[PDB]
């Protein structure tokens, strides 16, 4: 409703870096808010794409940002009569970023890995890897839970069980309030997808440079499966956390699996031990239900609600014709021990091929009426197809079915405006939570500042 579309702030990165592919707010030990920005194709040392991360101080005029530097060098370790290798070319550093406390977590889902032993090898595969930084102290750590030292022959003999070689750890990511990092790994267990969790504190204290294979014992991975419903389901494509079981001591996980069950799609809610609490099935095959998931209480009853985006949902139209426009589903959490039901609300896109629901961002309470609100992106939507972000206000009954405000992409065609979104933080300290929108295709980020209701 009250985001200002007249005076925006633009941050920019190098051409072709895909600056804006992922972003998040970051507070330093003093509570000063900055913006961390991923740029998955930033040029590395050998003039080869490795991705990169930028830490933008807040300034109304915006501009350029300093790098958050990480080691971009391939590594080799000859140990235990084996040769360990990390490959960082085209690893996509910054394909995801998240901030928790004074710590930043940036992931390279396509970092490759291999182990050699005589004439055998594990195979060079994209295990993915995450880099952790404490900007104010210069501390650095890594987390790469899918790295292994088993040779090919073994996987083949065991029928490819517990095969974490194509994890792509960090494809998505989130951190619990308590500081547990939860990585999505859509390629885990031969493309079923798995989740890797470990306390940030333990990642730092157990990491040393040059080891490559080390134990983080407090870590916890999800499980393999023989159930075909899960094959190629990309469980972990998206991830989020929230409270869904009534017990404030336990934290629950929300995992997107957009191709679950032969591309029907699904999203699941789990306890911290990866036991399934609820499962929500997609509505239409190939709609990519679970592409994005968002958690926030929208009807002010203190119970977290779930939103799921299916950006390729095809809406039914006159004369038995379907039109791809994308859709978002709202599930309100019921009182006491009960299972989520049919969605309470369906939001459907309008622009053909617009991909409404590609990203969903909690805004907190934008107009300060006591109900939390959301922003939904349609990266190729709008009458011009340049991209749109639509705001929906919370209400006692859920969400308003019509957008209170629409933000049209200020960038040129192909910018993918809205592909990444983040709200619920007051960056300029005027008492109203603000919105940042990535346009990786244009290598830029836009900041919308919330203002008093007109």
């Amino acid at each position: 409703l009250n985001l200002d579309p007249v005076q925006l702030t633009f941050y920019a990165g190098p051409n072709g870096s895909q600056f804006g592919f992922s972003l998040d707010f970051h507070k330093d030990s003093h509570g000063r808010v900055a913006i961390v920005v991923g740029a998955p194709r930033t040029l590395g040392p050998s003039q080869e794409e490795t991705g990169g991360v930028f830490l933008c101080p807040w300034r109304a005029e915006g501009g350029q940002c300093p790098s958050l530097l990480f080691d971009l060098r391939d590594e080799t370790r000859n140990v235990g009569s084996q040769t360990l290798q990390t490959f960082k070319a085209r690893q996509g550093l910054g394909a995801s970023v998240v901030s928790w406390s004074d710590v930043i977590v940036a992931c390279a889902p396509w970092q490759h890995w291999n182990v050699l032993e005589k004439t055998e090898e594990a195979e060079k595969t994209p295990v993915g890897s995450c880099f952790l930084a404490q900007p104010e102290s210069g501390r650095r750590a890594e987390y790469s839970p899918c790295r292994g030292n088993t040779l090919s022959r073994i996987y083949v003999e065991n029928d490819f069980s517990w095969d974490k070689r194509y994890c792509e750890a960090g494809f998505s990511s989130v951190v619990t309030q308590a500081g547990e990092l939860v990585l999505g790994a859509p390629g885990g267990y031969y493309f079923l997808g798995l989740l890797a969790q470990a306390p940030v504190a333990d990642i730092f204290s157990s990491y040393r440079p040059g080891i490559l294979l080390w134990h983080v014992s407090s870590q916890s991975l999800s499980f393999d499966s023989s159930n075909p419903e899960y094959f190629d389901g990309y469980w972990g494509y998206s991830v989020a956390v929230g409270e869904f079981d009534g017990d404030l001591n336990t934290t629950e996980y929300v995992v997107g699996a957009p191709t679950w069950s032969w591309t029907l799609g699904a999203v699941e809610i789990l306890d911290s031990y990866y036991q399934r609490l609820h499962r929500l099935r997609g509505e239409q095959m190939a709609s990519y239900f679970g592409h994005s998931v968002a958690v926030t209480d929208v009807n002010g009853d203190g119970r977290h609600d779930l939103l799921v985006g299916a950006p390729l949902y095809m809406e039914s139209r006159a004369d038995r014709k379907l039109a791809e426009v994308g859709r978002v589903y709202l599930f309100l959490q019921p009182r006491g021990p009960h299972a989520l039901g049919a969605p309470s609300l369906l939001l459907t896109g309008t622009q053909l091929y617009g991909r409404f629901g590609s990203a969903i961002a909690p805004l907190g309470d934008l107009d300060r009426d006591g109900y939390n609100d959301i922003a939904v992106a349609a990266p190729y939507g709008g009458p011009s197809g340049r991209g749109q972000v639509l705001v929906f206000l919370g209400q006692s009954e859920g969400l308003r079915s019509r957008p209170s405000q629409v933000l049209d992409s200020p960038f040129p065609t192909g910018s993918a405006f809205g592909f990444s979104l983040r709200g619920a933080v007051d960056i300029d300290d005027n008492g109203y939570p603000d919105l940042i929108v990535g346009a990786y295709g244009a290598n830029q980020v836009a900041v919308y500042r919330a203002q008093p209701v007109v």
């Epitope: 000859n78 140990v79 235990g80 073994i154 040393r208 080891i211 294979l213 080390w214 134990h215 983080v216």
Partner: antibody, heavy 119, light 108 residues
């Protein structure tokens, strides 16, 4: 806390066999590699071999091939070392070892189990 | 098998001393070394892994250094408990192999 409780001292006759045990305490035996090391006063420290309790795959020093047999039962969080055709030279102290962080390291040690072969 | 030559076999030093134990390998092991301690009539305790990294709980007066095939353990300001047996171990290759060991003894 990580503790490796090894079985009690063994006193066996030559030509016999014995099976030492090493039980993980405060953690899951399946977490890391588990190694066995032999110590003698004069000869010093010798690496016997390791097992990966997660899957049962073992490695040995060819010197101990046919003599030592390393196994593990995740169910009881315990690892074992079986010695056969015991002789007077097999008389020594035996340790189970695991790494702290580094996959290949030797950081944590059991208290040790003495083995005496005599008629 | 990689040969680990640990010198000296023993040294008679005093408290507060700063001593150094060297370890020589038959070939390059690129920091894939560990240092161990065995207090008299007791089990082993880990000191260092990967050449220079302190095991959790070990005092910082212990330090590790070296590269290629030559590495050193160095204790600054010896304590009364520091009088014991010290061994090195290489895990660059299987089989893992150990050093002859070194025994710190009180000087009088």
């Amino acid at each position: 806390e990580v503790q490796l409780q090894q079985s009690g001292a063994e006193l066996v006759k030559p030509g016999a066999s014995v099976k030492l045990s090493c039980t993980a305490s405060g953690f899951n035996i399946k977490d890391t590699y588990v190694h066995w090391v032999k110590q003698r006063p004069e000869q010093g420290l010798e690496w016997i071999g390791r097992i990966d309790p997660a899957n049962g795959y073992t490695k040995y020093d060819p010197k101990f091939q046919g003599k030592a047999t390393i196994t593990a039962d995740t169910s009881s969080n315990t690892a074992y070392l079986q010695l056969s055709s015991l002789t007077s030279e097999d008389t020594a102290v035996y340790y189970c070892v695991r790494p702290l962080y580094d996959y290949y390291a030797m950081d944590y040690w059991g208290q040790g189990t003495s083995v005496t072969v005599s008629s | 098998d990689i040969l680990m030559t640990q010198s000296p076999s023993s040294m008679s030093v005093s408290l507060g001393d700063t001593v150094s134990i060297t370890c020589h390998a038959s070939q390059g092991i690129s920091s894939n070394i560990g240092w161990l301690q065995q207090k008299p009539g007791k089990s082993f305790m880990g000191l260092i892994y990967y050449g220079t990294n302190l095991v959790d709980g070990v005092p910082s007066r212990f330090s590790g250094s070296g590269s290629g095939a030559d590495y050193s353990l160095t204790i600054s300001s010896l304590d009364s408990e520091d009088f014991a047996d010290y061994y090195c171990v290489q895990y660059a290759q299987l089989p893992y192999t150990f050093g002859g060991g070194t025994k710190l003894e009180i000087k009088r």
